[PDB]
Scaffold this active site. Structure first.
Site, PDB file in Angstrom:
ATOM      1  N   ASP A   1       0.826  -1.218   0.000  1.00 13.09           N
ATOM      2  CA  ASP A   1       0.000   0.000   0.000  1.00 13.09           C
ATOM      3  C   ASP A   1       0.860   1.268   0.000  1.00 13.09           C
ATOM      4  O   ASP A   1       0.526   2.258  -0.656  1.00 13.09           O
ATOM      5  CB  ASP A   1      -0.943   0.016   1.220  1.00 13.09           C
TER       6      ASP A   1
ATOM      7  N   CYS B   1      -2.285   0.589 -13.492  1.00 15.58           N
ATOM      8  CA  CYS B   1      -2.367   0.602 -12.030  1.00 15.58           C
ATOM      9  C   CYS B   1      -3.553   1.490 -11.687  1.00 15.58           C
ATOM     10  O   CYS B   1      -4.597   1.347 -12.315  1.00 15.58           O
ATOM     11  CB  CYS B   1      -1.043   1.021 -11.416  1.00 15.58           C
TER      12      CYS B   1
ATOM     13  N   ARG C   1       3.551   2.649 -10.776  1.00 14.29           N
ATOM     14  CA  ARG C   1       3.875   1.223 -10.939  1.00 14.29           C
ATOM     15  C   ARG C   1       3.944   0.816 -12.407  1.00 14.29           C
ATOM     16  O   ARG C   1       4.794   0.008 -12.802  1.00 14.29           O
ATOM     17  CB  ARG C   1       2.814   0.361 -10.218  1.00 14.29           C
ATOM     18  N   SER C   2       2.998   1.296 -13.215  1.00 15.51           N
ATOM     19  CA  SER C   2       2.992   0.955 -14.643  1.00 15.51           C
ATOM     20  C   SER C   2       4.289   1.394 -15.321  1.00 15.51           C
ATOM     21  O   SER C   2       4.794   0.710 -16.231  1.00 15.51           O
ATOM     22  CB  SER C   2       1.804   1.626 -15.335  1.00 15.51           C
TER      23      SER C   2
ATOM     24  N   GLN D   1       6.662   7.861 -10.284  1.00 16.87           N
ATOM     25  CA  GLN D   1       6.004   8.922  -9.502  1.00 16.87           C
ATOM     26  C   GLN D   1       6.796   9.378  -8.284  1.00 16.87           C
ATOM     27  O   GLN D   1       6.449  10.409  -7.682  1.00 16.87           O
ATOM     28  CB  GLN D   1       4.637   8.434  -9.018  1.00 16.87           C
TER      29      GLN D   1
HETATM   30  O1  LIG Z   1       0.352  12.884  -7.221  1.00 13.66           O
HETATM   31  C1  LIG Z   1      -0.797  12.689  -6.870  1.00 13.66           C
HETATM   32  O2  LIG Z   1      -1.252  12.779  -5.717  1.00 13.66           O
HETATM   33  C2  LIG Z   1      -1.926  12.263  -8.049  1.00 13.66           C
HETATM   34  O3  LIG Z   1      -1.559  11.427  -9.120  1.00 13.66           O
HETATM   35  C3  LIG Z   1      -1.693  10.132  -8.884  1.00 13.66           C
HETATM   36  C4  LIG Z   1      -2.834   9.598  -8.316  1.00 13.66           C
HETATM   37  C5  LIG Z   1      -2.934   8.280  -7.967  1.00 13.66           C
HETATM   38  C6  LIG Z   1      -1.884   7.441  -8.202  1.00 13.66           C
HETATM   39  C7  LIG Z   1      -0.820   7.969  -8.764  1.00 13.66           C
HETATM   40 CL1  LIG Z   1       0.443   7.069  -9.040  1.00 13.66          CL
HETATM   41  C8  LIG Z   1      -0.711   9.253  -9.087  1.00 13.66           C
END
Ligand SMILES: O=C(O)COc1cccc(Cl)c1
Length: 298
Positions: free
Chosen positions: A181, A215, A221-222, A262
């Site tokens: 998580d 994802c 993850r992708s 990310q």
């Molecule tokens: O940076 C953020 O909070 C929004 O962008 C995302 C939302 C959900 C998952 C992922 Cl990897 C990024």
């Protein structure tokens, strides 16, 4: 620099956040105008994650051709991938339309339907053989054929039927169920074992359309999955494997979809996976069995 010693040098200097911010600064910026049209608001899971216009997948449909999905085409490696968000209640029919129209063999899912107590994507495939799914808006039928549940992942065989033409196709669903998580996995052994299972199925090969990988947002993850796959393929193709530059490959992939990888932790993990995977590939074939064992998938 080479990879494994560039790695040791960033670890000792504790500069992963700075390396990652450089990537964010250099990354391409292309328009995403179709994604932002008002009629498409309920087709996007996150307002800050959109496909670029130049690389978006178009549905074959004259009313609205939009889906939040991007074609990542890697020229030297000769691999293509479709990266997409987790389907929404109102886009599950669009999702399977894309799979059909792009001639994909495999779908790679890197999230659980519920994480951190909130829904991360829709339950978009059937859970029991005898309870098939019908998507009326796109005229498709989807049936579960078989399911193989392992310790780190589950593989499903699915049948997709185009109800307009009565044609049918077999789709493989590769579901990585153990990504934590929070953070990233401590060892890349189970992720590499999973990647090799996808490869062994034919789902990444040129005789099929591009694999569909998702994802929740389709970038984190992708992005880790396709970056590791592409780097390992280049190391096998080239005369000098130490000439593969993971940061340059990542910036190339970011020409086709925004935001891939990310966090600085995801970047470090991608390095780890490519490094360990390059040892198991060789010329060392036995390493594959080692990953399987270390993954405790049974
Ligand atoms: O940076 C953020 O909070 C929004 O962008 C995302 C939302 C959900 C998952 C992922 Cl990897 C990024």
């Amino acid at each position: 620099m080479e990879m494994e010693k560039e790695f040791e040098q960033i670890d000792k200097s504790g500069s992963w956040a700075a390396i990652y911010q450089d990537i964010r600064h250099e990354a391409s910026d292309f328009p995403s105008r179709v994604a932002k049209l008002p009629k498409n608001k309920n087709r996007n899971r996150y307002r800050d994650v959109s496909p670029f216009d130049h690389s978006r997948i178009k549905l074959h449909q004259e009313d609205n051709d939009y889906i939040n999905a991007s074609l990542i085409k890697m020229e030297e490696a000769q691999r293509s991938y479709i990266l997409t968000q987790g389907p929404l209640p109102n886009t599950v029919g669009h999702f399977w339309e894309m799979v059909w129209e792009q001639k994909s063999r495999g779908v790679v899912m890197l999230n659980r339907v519920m994480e951190k107590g909130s829904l991360k994507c829709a339950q978009y495939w059937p859970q029991k053989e005898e309870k098939e799914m019908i998507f009326e808006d796109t005229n498709l039928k989807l049936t579960l054929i078989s399911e193989d549940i392992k310790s780190y992942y589950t593989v499903r065989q699915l049948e997709l039927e185009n109800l307009t033409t009565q044609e049918t196709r077999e789709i493989l669903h590769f579901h990585y169920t153990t990504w934590p998580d929070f953070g990233v996995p401590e060892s890349p052994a189970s992720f590499l074992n999973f990647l090799f299972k996808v490869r062994e199925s034919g789902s990444l090969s040129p005789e099929h359309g591009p694999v569909v990988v998702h994802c929740s947002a389709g970038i984190g993850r992708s992005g880790t999955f396709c970056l590791a796959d592409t780097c390992l393929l280049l190391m096998d193709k080239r005369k000098d494997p130490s000439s593969v530059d993971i940061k340059k490959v990542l910036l190339e992939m970011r020409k086709f979809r925004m935001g891939l990888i990310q966090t600085a932790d995801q970047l470090r993990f991608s390095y780890l996976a490519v490094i360990e995977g390059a040892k198991f590939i060789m010329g060392d074939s036995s390493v594959q069995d080692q990953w399987k064992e270390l993954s405790h998938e049974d």
